[PDB]
């Protein structure tokens, strides 16, 4: 009965990941005054499945200069960590209930940067090495602020358990007492997931395709499934943390439906953002995060350390 | 209110193709279920519609026949299947359909259109249309 419960997590997520590729191509379409896919199936609904099938019948590439062990490991790691980020998410009851879920999300997210690094390095190509060394630069940019932002929000929550955020937001979104951190949190998630205007590791304009330039076929498909799963998860995580869905102990179906509506809406804003802005320069990404966000995040960390103290609003341990 | 008018046009388009079979046939062949005015039809079976309220470029369109010259074109439609009389109207090179301004008849004009025959056994094959230039000597057929 637990195996059936994995099915009803990993399969709906994978289906939802695929259609995000369709929603991306049609929202980008209509925002660009065109229609996006709409021939492959009714309104393109079969277009995601065509792309998947075609990619797994495409010849896979084994470049002569490549380090095969890491070349193969990297896409496999990418998609594993994308699916593993989901098992602790409470919706409103998580598949795996962890006391330090927030750290499991932080630690799993960091380890997924090594799929970019190892793949790029293992390709033994100049454009793939440029892409990898932007993954290093991008992580050094957003890592420090992203952890501290979480610390600030969790001092109103009382613990690193994700399931306790449901109870913190019983009467109010954390977005209100924390909208400065949500603004900084949201931009971090665009950097965490290599999403425009921060698609610097890929960055088709400057690097031909960045880290995955030497990847074709099914191995390259796994990288994308990982990229789009993370988009849903990071916005799903942002919905739990800051936009707490309605939770009634008698209507757990209500929390999921409301959780989905806000997660879909936030996922759309990622697609909305990609259609609206030019791409950052990856040196300027560091300056954004270290010279703007970091000074503000440290101050808000000190604000939220003191805030429960001088209002006697310390969250409970349990 | 306006939202209801929109659903009115939506219903009117869903039921305006003659049954469920009609709506599925048009929707999966053209991926479009608008309701134009039938402007005419050709000897091959293409139907020509128009709606001048649409913006220039979608105000005229053709639903290709499902069988032309013995080929099955239920799914395989290509723009070369429009004959030359409608080719001019369909491309907005004029303003009046052939049903009201027919082309001048000629005895050499093709009666039966022919679409792109590339890849098929009807395909054109180039060759030289001149005759031999240098004529060779023919030896006697007898001993000397």
């Amino acid at each position: 009965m637990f195996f059936i419960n994995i099915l009803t997590l990993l399969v709906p997520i994978l289906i939802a990941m695929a259609f995000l590729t369709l929603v991306e191509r049609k929202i980008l379409g209509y925002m660009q005054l065109r229609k996006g896919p709409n021939i492959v199936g009714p309104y393109g609904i079969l277009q995601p499945f065509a792309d998947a099938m075609k990619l797994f019948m495409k010849e896979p590439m084994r470049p002569l200069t490549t380090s095969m062990s890491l070349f193969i490991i990297a896409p496999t790691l990418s998609l594993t960590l994308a699916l593993s980020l989901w098992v602790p998410l409470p919706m409103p009851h998580p598949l795996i209930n962890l006391n330090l879920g927030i750290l499991f999300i932080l630690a799993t997210s960091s380890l997924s940067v090594y799929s970019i690094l190892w793949s790029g390095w293992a390709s033994n190509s100049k454009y793939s090495l440029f892409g990898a060394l932007r993954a290093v630069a991008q992580t050094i940019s957003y890592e420090v602020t992203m952890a501290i932002i979480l610390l600030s929000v969790l001092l109103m929550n009382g613990s690193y358990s994700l399931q306790t955020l449901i109870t913190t937001q019983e009467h109010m979104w954390l977005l209100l007492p924390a909208w400065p951190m949500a603004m900084m949190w949201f931009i971090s998630t665009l950097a965490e997931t290599n999403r425009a205007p921060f698609d610097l590791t890929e960055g088709e304009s400057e690097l031909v395709s960045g880290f995955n330039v030497e990847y074709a076929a099914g191995p390259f498909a796994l990288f994308f499934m990982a990229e789009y799963t993370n988009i849903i998860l990071m916005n799903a995580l942002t919905t739990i943390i800051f936009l707490g869905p309605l939770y009634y102990i008698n209507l757990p179906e209500l929390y999921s439906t409301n959780f989905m509506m806000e997660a879909l809406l936030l996922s759309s804003t990622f697609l909305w953002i990609r259609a609206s802005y030019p791409r950052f320069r990856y040196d300027q990404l560091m300056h954004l995060l270290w010279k703007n966000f970091l000074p503000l995040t440290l101050a808000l960390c000190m604000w939220h350390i003191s805030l429960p103290i001088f209002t006697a609003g310390v969250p409970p341990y349990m | 209110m306006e939202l209801v008018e929109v659903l009115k046009r939506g219903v009117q388009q869903v039921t305006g193709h003659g049954g469920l079979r009609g709506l599925l046939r048009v929707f999966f062949r053209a991926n479009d279920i608008r309701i134009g005015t039938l402007v005419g039809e050709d000897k091959y079976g293409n139907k020509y519609y128009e709606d001048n309220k649409q913006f220039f470029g979608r105000h005229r369109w053709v639903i290709y026949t499902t069988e032309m010259n013995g080929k099955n074109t239920f799914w395989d439609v290509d723009g070369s299947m429009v004959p030359p009389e409608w080719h001019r109207w369909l491309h907005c090179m004029t303003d009046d359909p052939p049903t009201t301004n027919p082309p001048t008849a000629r005895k050499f004009i093709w009666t039966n259109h022919k679409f792109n025959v590339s890849a098929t056994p009807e395909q054109y094959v180039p060759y030289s249309t001149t005759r031999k230039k240098i004529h060779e000597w023919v030896p006697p057929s007898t001993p000397y």
Partner: protein, 178 residues
């Protein structure tokens, strides 16, 4: 007369009213929200797409497309092998041979257009004194082999008979501009 695109240094003083506006611009990302608005407005505009191949892009009667050899209303070929289309062709795309016919007429035994040399300039259409060679309105004639794009006389006369109904009306709509 000239104008400055990026000059504005008629420096004003930063009022507390104005400084707080600069800060709200920077902290609240206001100009970046304006850009999000412009792409949101486009989402609710009707797309400019047309439903090809069921809908076609507009064309004019002058459109320079596929070539064709025309006839007179009696069915006689218009081409008299003058070779002026050949002398003008910028691409040397036309090859012609001629001789007296069986009835004595001046007619071509060969007439080729290598449609892979042609630049579709329409100059042959202008040079022809009897409207024999024209560029019809066809543009959907891509092939699966190079050799199918070397048109000899039979192919070009066949295009003439295929498209005459439409060619004749385009000349009727445009010859007065020529």
């Amino acid at each position: 007369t000239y104008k400055y695109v990026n000059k504005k240094e008629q420096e004003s003083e930063v009022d507390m009213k104005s400084a707080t506006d600069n800060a709200a611009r920077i902290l609240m990302w206001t100009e970046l929200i304006r850009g999000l608005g412009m792409t949101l407005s486009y989402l609710f505009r009707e797309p400019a797409t047309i439903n090809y191949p069921f809908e076609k892009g507009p064309l004019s009667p002058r459109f320079r497309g596929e070539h064709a050899l025309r006839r007179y209303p009696s069915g006689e070929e218009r081409c008299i092998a003058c070779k002026l289309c050949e002398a003008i062709c910028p691409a040397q795309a036309i090859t012609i041979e001629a001789e007296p016919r069986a009835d004595g007429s001046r007619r071509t035994t060969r007439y080729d257009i290598d449609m892979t040399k042609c630049i579709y300039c329409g100059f042959c259409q202008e040079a022809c004194p009897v409207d024999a060679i024209v560029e019809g309105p066809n543009f959907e004639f891509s092939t699966e082999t190079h050799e199918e794009l070397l048109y000899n006389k039979e192919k070009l006369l066949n295009n003439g008979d295929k498209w005459e109904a439409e060619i004749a009306a385009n000349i009727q709509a445009d010859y007065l501009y020529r």
